């Protein structure tokens, strides 16, 4: 099963600033990494897939990157409302495994 690992699990950035959330698969997963966002007490929203393709209508301030086993989501100009849990998923071969979710505190 490919294990996706996220560390740390809590992150704090200021408003208007930037955060980078690292995710890490345990084998080369060929950029087949999806990032979901789960706004406090709501569903996940698919933010990006294939490491950097933004889904329909997430604002270009959410940028992802990666190769191999190391991927990262960057948020720039952090809105007070980006406070949520961010989750990486793997989308290469079954089963679709997730990462622990990183909580983003606003400072």
């Amino acid at each position: 099963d490919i294990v996706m690992t996220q560390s740390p699990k809590f992150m704090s950035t200021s408003v208007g600033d930037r955060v980078t959330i690292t995710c890490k698969a345990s084998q080369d997963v060929s950029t087949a990494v999806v990032w979901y966002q789960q706004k406090p007490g709501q569903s996940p929203k698919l933010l990006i897939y294939w490491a950097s393709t933004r889904h329909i209508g997430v604002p270009d301030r959410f940028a992802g990157s990666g190769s191999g086993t190391d991927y990262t989501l960057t948020i720039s100009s952090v809105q007070a409302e980006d406070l949520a849990l961010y989750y990486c998923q793997q989308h290469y071969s079954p089963p679709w495994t997730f990462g622990g979710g990183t909580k983003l505190e606003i400072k």
Binding site: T31, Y49, W50, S52, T53, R54, H55, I56, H91, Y92, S93, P94
Partner: protein
């Protein structure tokens, strides 16, 4: 025929699609001596049409099918067999040895080119009338590649597009003009395209159209139009917002004619199109992220108008079913007023998505074009990955 072929006709009115060929190769290969293939295609002789495809040198069931997800090796070989029969050990003809091919027939006999080699020191050998005539050693030294479907010839001359270089960035793509196996000339890729892979080509009214693959930045497909007579070409993109490569960004309102459309870098899937003014039809997978489903869309003027959204469509493979590579072909010797347009859809079964098994084979589906409006059906590969366990 006993005479070169000239593309004297134009395409017929494409109003719907009728199934032309079905393989069922993986379903029958669970209990028959079937070959593991991929990169399939279809080409016609004056005489007959056949399924072509790159063998992996093993049967689905044999223990050496394990690890056939790897694209190139010395066990691969361009093979060929009857329309709609599976690619069986006992009925496949080996056309040449290599891991990239293209094959076409010029009216008199056929040209097959198989590329082989280590990635840094590969060579192309051009077979003509089943004997090696010309060979072309690498030029940029990192994986020399070519068409993956039939080429098109006008009066002896067959343009074949080759890329050598990186699939992540600028690569050396050259258009070669052969006639009867010998190289008549070659020029380098010219035009607004930014990267070229696996060009699907068809030919009408003395001109050759190739929808290729932009692997570096493209999600819209780049198009090469080659004058076979004057031995020149140009390259632009498909303007239409109806993006057809895969994976892709979601389709926009307005698109990009002279540049790659942004969103999914370092990826694609070989694909095709029929560009004929109002009678333009495009095909993409149904999924934006994966090779599942395959559908055809009539998008009048998609080459040139950059807000062309589809007016008629047709579901070929269901989105809950797998697809893969597609490419154009026509039976240039069939009787009539015009060219019946046709294509094929590789159906990839196996690793990586269905990794319960260790092989990757594929099945093939073919359809040609009807002037009628025939009703539609979906066409699944059909095997159950659970009976191979």
């Amino acid at each position: 025929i006993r005479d070169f072929n000239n593309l004297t006709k134009g395409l017929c009115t494409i109003n719907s699609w009728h199934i032309y060929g079905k393989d069922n190769a993986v379903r029958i290969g669970e209990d028959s001596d079937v070959l593991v293939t991929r990169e399939p295609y279809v080409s016609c002789d004056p005489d007959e049409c056949r399924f072509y495809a790159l063998s992996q040198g093993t049967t689905i069931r044999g223990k050496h099918s394990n690890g056939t997800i790897h694209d190139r090796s010395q066990y691969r070989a361009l093979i060929s067999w009857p329309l709609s029969s599976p690619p069986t050990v006992y009925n496949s003809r080996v056309e040449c040895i290599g891991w990239s091919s293209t094959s076409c027939h010029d009216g008199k006999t056929r040209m097959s080119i198989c590329i082989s080699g280590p990635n840094n020191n590969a060579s192309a050998v051009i077979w003509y009338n089943r004997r090696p005539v010309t060979e072309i050693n690498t030029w940029a030294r990192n994986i020399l590649r070519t068409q993956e479907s039939e080429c098109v010839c006008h009066n002896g001359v067959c343009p074949v597009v080759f890329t050598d270089g990186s699939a992540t960035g600028p690569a050396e793509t050259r258009i070669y003009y052969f006639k009867e196996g010998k190289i008549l000339k070659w020029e380098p890729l010219a035009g607004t395209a930014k990267h070229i892979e696996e060009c699907s080509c068809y030919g009408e009214r003395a001109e050759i159209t190739c929808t290729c693959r932009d692997n570096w930045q493209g999600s819209n497909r780049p198009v090469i139009r080659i004058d076979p007579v004057a031995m020149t070409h140009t390259s632009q993109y498909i303007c239409s917002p109806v993006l057809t490569d895969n994976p892709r960004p979601d389709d926009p309102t307005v698109g990009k004619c002279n540049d790659p459309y942004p969103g999914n870098n370092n990826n694609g899937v070989k694909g095709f199109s029929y560009l004929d003014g109002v009678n333009t039809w495009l095909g993409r997978t149904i999924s934006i992220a994966s090779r599942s489903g395959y559908e055809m869309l009539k998008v009048p003027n998609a080459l040139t108008d950059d807000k062309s959204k589809p007016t008629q469509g047709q579901t070929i493979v269901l989105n809950t079913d797998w697809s893969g590579y597609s490419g154009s072909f026509m039976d240039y010797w069939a009787e009539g007023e015009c060219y019946r347009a046709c294509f094929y859809v590789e159906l990839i079964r196996g690793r990586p998505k269905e990794d319960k098994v260790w092989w990757t084979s594929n099945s093939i589906v073919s359809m040609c074009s009807s002037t009628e409006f025939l009703g539609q059906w979906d066409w699944p590969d059909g095997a159950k990955i659970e009976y191979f366990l």
